[PDB]
Symmetry: C5
Subunit: 312 residues, 5 copies
Amino acid sequence: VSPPPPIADEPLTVNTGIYLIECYSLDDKAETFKVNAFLSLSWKDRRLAFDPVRSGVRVKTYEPEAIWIPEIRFVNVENARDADVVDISVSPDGTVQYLERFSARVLSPLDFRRYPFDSQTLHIYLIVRSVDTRNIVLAVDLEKVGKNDDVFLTGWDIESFTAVVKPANFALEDRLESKLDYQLRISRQYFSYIPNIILPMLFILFISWTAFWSTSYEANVTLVVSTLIAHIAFNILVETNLPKTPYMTYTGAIIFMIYLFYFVAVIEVTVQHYLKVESQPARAASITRASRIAFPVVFLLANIILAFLFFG
Amino acid sequence: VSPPPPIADEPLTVNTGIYLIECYSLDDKAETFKVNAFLSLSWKDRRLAFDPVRSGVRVKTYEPEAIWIPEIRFVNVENARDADVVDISVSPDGTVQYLERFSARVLSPLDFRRYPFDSQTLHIYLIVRSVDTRNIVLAVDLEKVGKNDDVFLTGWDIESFTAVVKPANFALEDRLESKLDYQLRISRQYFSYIPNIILPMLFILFISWTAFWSTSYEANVTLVVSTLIAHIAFNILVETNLPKTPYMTYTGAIIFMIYLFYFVAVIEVTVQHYLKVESQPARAASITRASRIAFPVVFLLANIILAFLFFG
Amino acid sequence: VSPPPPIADEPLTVNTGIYLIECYSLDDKAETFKVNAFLSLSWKDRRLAFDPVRSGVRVKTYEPEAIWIPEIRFVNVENARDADVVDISVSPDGTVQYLERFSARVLSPLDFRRYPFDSQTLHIYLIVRSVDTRNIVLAVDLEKVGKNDDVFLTGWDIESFTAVVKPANFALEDRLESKLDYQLRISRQYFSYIPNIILPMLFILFISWTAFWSTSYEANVTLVVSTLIAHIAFNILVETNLPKTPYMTYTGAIIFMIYLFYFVAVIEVTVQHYLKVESQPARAASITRASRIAFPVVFLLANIILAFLFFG
Amino acid sequence: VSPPPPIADEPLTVNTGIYLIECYSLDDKAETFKVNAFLSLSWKDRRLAFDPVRSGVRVKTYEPEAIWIPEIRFVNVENARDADVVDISVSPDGTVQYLERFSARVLSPLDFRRYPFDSQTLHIYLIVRSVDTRNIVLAVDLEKVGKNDDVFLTGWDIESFTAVVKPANFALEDRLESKLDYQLRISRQYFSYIPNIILPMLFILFISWTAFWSTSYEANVTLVVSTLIAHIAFNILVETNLPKTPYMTYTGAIIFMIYLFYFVAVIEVTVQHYLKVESQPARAASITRASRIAFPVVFLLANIILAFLFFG
Amino acid sequence: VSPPPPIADEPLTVNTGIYLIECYSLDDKAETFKVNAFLSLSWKDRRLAFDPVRSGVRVKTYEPEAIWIPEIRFVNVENARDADVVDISVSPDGTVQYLERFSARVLSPLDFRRYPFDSQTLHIYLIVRSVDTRNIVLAVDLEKVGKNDDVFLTGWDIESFTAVVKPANFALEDRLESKLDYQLRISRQYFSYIPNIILPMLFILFISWTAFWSTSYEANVTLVVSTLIAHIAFNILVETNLPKTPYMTYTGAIIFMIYLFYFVAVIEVTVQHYLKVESQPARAASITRASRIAFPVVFLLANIILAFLFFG
Ligand SMILES: [Cl-]
Ligand SMILES: [Cl-]
Ligand SMILES: [Cl-]
Ligand SMILES: [Cl-]
Ligand SMILES: [Cl-]
């Protein structure tokens, strides 16, 4: 119909609230997730007031096409939400209670600096646009914000679901707008990464390090290059999941360090064989004895330094 | 129109029933499946009673827009169901029979602790919301719950399809709700996993174990590392299907144990060669003779212990 | 409007017919295909009879919303068909001719016991439900069943498209139903499988068998294990297409037999080297000479036996 | 409303024309492509004639629901086209001009006998069905057939877009139909295939051929088998794109020939080693000297013969 | 209703403007992206003028079905946009302000000549078609063109979003059309490509180059061929992302050069062994000493020349 008119100049306040039902399909590469929740709205319309005694009823039920309903939209969605109306009720003083169930796909950036052990915050933005006759603002109803106990995300742990009470008011396309922020905090389940990726990689590296206790050139070459091939296959498998980022991450640094270590091991084997052929066995023995202790200690120190750099 | 009014205060009872027609597209990674079934509803509306003699008919046929129909919704669905109405009939006393055919996608968690030999239970939740004038509850009609004989799931065996008679009543968004639980029990067909994965892996391990009957260092190195590469390829192929879980599974433990065994075999080969070079052949012979018996027995004992731990 | 009334008690007969236009997207893993065809219906309604002389016309054209049309549904479809009405015409005696074009996705199980050389039968089920005032049955019009000459399936040969004349009548949800069966017979084009998979595998096996003409342990080990790795890669590539079945197939048996042969070849090489080291060259020579003839003959006999078992 | 009536018996002629705007998503495996074009129709309706002087206008604009419009359909489409009406105008003599923009997915078979250097023809079929009162035929308007200059297909070169003027008239479902044929000629861009696939394969084969200048059995075995593994990986990568066909193609023949060459090279190495061990060095030298020249010449001759067979 | 009439002959001017909200899903292989933006339109209709004093209002709000709205379409879209109307307001003099929010998928070609370090320009075309009574042209409103500060593309850096003020007027299908061009400039984030692809490839090549400091034929063969296999795997992984182009790119040239270098290294190893066997050690020593310096210098010079050719 038409937005309600003020007494003198006051803005119209709409109280909102979101109750989560389902959360699924978190795509790391596309930075998307899908949601299924309740949307609650409430405002005051004095034109709908009635006398309970004369009417003989306490609550009046309306239809969406029979009264004025504010237009609320989500900002970071791929398309408009698929919503259906559940209930509309009017109090004797004119207060309207609105409820609906929707479904939508949300876009939200992610941070991968600590990819196996990272935490993320997902954002949902609600906006309303002011009409040429009235100014509309948004508020938060704290008793209508929550989530179901059966909400589960495959691979993540859900911590909290709150909202920022203070809205943001600005001007866009020669009109005023109000924005609300709903935040969902999640943590990644990293248990499966240890025995699936972390430990076999260490085993393969330790297997490659056995060339320092041998003097056969062909066996050393075979060991080191074959372990390198296995490392390449594991790196391809891991990289199939991580997206491309404009910064450095923990896993990428570790993989690059492993490549560097393989290169240095090849150089050491080559040097030892060259010295042995040149009839200098003592120097080659000394070099291989040094390397036997040098490689693991440097690996451990570099890993400690990287862990401090990325998590400290 | 409007919900029927009670005599004094009694709640309105709606009898439900689901008859399965199709079941397909069980996605382990997404924890989803698709369904195609009949939905049956029945309640009492005294305002629709008629006299069979005066009307000359026994059953009156209505349209969905001409009478009041309760709003029933599924809880764990990605979107609202696609339904069409099949038949609406009214008995002379006012009893309404409703039938429809729908299609929907259901979300349900799965347990993978015994992944090759596991059984699952799938859940379908039906809910109804009470209106401001009447209270509505849900019931189960046992003669209208069942499934077709041609219902098939690719890779699973269907056991039963029942419903929990007792509903759950609670308060949500300042209104009362009633919930029903439909359970479908399935079992995985594990026949194909044995000759496709289990036995070739054993063959490859046995091939790698042949290095204990040889004294050539290069051949032993080649055998063990190449078998390791084959193991890595098989592990990648198997892991392409299993999702990531916050707990330990049977297959993952077995794979990790195989990696450990390969590492120990490499260490044994390296030790034997080092002892042989150092002019101590008897100690190397003794070690290799011990290992020849030690490896299979330990493998068998560890497999028995793991099987008891996960299935006992 | 309302279903036509009988004279005394006779059921209403609806003559059906399906004319195929397109067939595409046969998914072996999902056991699905898509269709695009014509649906023809015909029945008698005495309330629509007219006099050709008075009206001055021979055929009267109606609209779908102006007369009664029976509700026909497909049983094994994922969703309801997307149909549009092409023509409705009424004969002077009351016979109605109905035509429409639809599109749908069909679910039908497949048998993979002879996967490269198998034949399949696809099923389409038509059902109708009886109303509370009349009983409805289904019939087949043989002059309206057929297919286009340009219907093609990628990888299959289309043989015939017939229908079972006799319908199935039963009771479901306290009402009578009639079901018709349309069958489409197809055969797989197996030409490409021979030079793409069958012959290179034989070449690789023959290459691995060359180790029986050599006495170098390292070369034999390299040959056999590298050919095993190639076999594993080919097996992964083949298995990417075949779904998982609760029974044994031809290809799986062949692959398992090849794995067994590789294991036995490794054992033979190991035995020959062990005998040679132990200063028993005559026994090793005899064993290798025996194996040279033993392996191909056993392979051929096992292949003949398997072929007789699966196709005889 | 109703189709226009003839004077005595003449059929109704509809002039058609298609103007291409976009062409994209050519799927070789599914044999599909997507289109976005204009559809133009024109016919004569004498019931719509008006006097320009009395009306004071030259062109009258109508709505699609206010006049009769023929039903035109595409034959080889997966679903019905998504169309919207752009303009309807009527000339003073009764000639109607119709314009619309649609989008559709087309099915069309492809020929892969010369897959890297092949040319294809894509087909679009337009059909119309005759009503019980009038006969309708199709014609081609040559001034309204064309394509945009920015139409591009990823990986193909567009040559021409014409139409066959002569329609095909036949009887289907007891009615007459008229069919038109629109053809689009395309050519594949084969530039990228040379340096990406063709030349590295030749390099690998030449690398494998170096075993004829050596007398070390182990090195020869390593070279040949490792090059075979690389060939298998390249063949898998190439075959990921080509679909399965009931005939032989150029690429498949070349790959099979390369497999045959690898097998013969293995046999030659094995024979040379066996002769050398048997204290017959001259015969092995002669054989290897012959093979050094024999292999490339036979390869070149076989390639020339295959090229003549497939392209001559 | 009907387009507004001119005074004598002037064309109707429509001022446009696009405000970006979201940009996502840039597919390199399909050459597509998705957008979510505001569309603003403005024109003059003298038939809607009113007197503010008599009406008592300053702005009049209409509905889309109550007034005439020009038909604006996007040219390079896969389907018609999904739009909803936000606001329609009319000034006292007759100026109409129109606003809507849409979503669409755009087709735009890309250039890959400098694929890791390339910049692209994306194009959005707006068109309008003239009616038979009035001529319509398009203009740009510079105060309504812009983008949000939170617009992000995964893997790209957004630089600017402007529009070409001058429209293109031409004739199509016997009517006049006007076209506008909106351009979006983006730059690829190339940081991740260095440590993920560029440096490990250099490490592998350097590892393969170690064969010039050895005289063991078998070890050299193993090193070079295994590094070649690793190169093939890396090349497959890189090529999985780049589409096929009718021209040469930087990455393809580099990969082809690496293949050439591997071939020449194999030839050098083979020559050295052949000379050594023929009792000419000095010539082989000289050749290997030359190659030790020759290979890296030629590699560096070729890389410099290629970089100058593609970027200079
Ligand atoms: Cl929205
Ligand atoms: Cl629902
Ligand atoms: Cl249906
Ligand atoms: Cl169509
Ligand atoms: Cl559009």
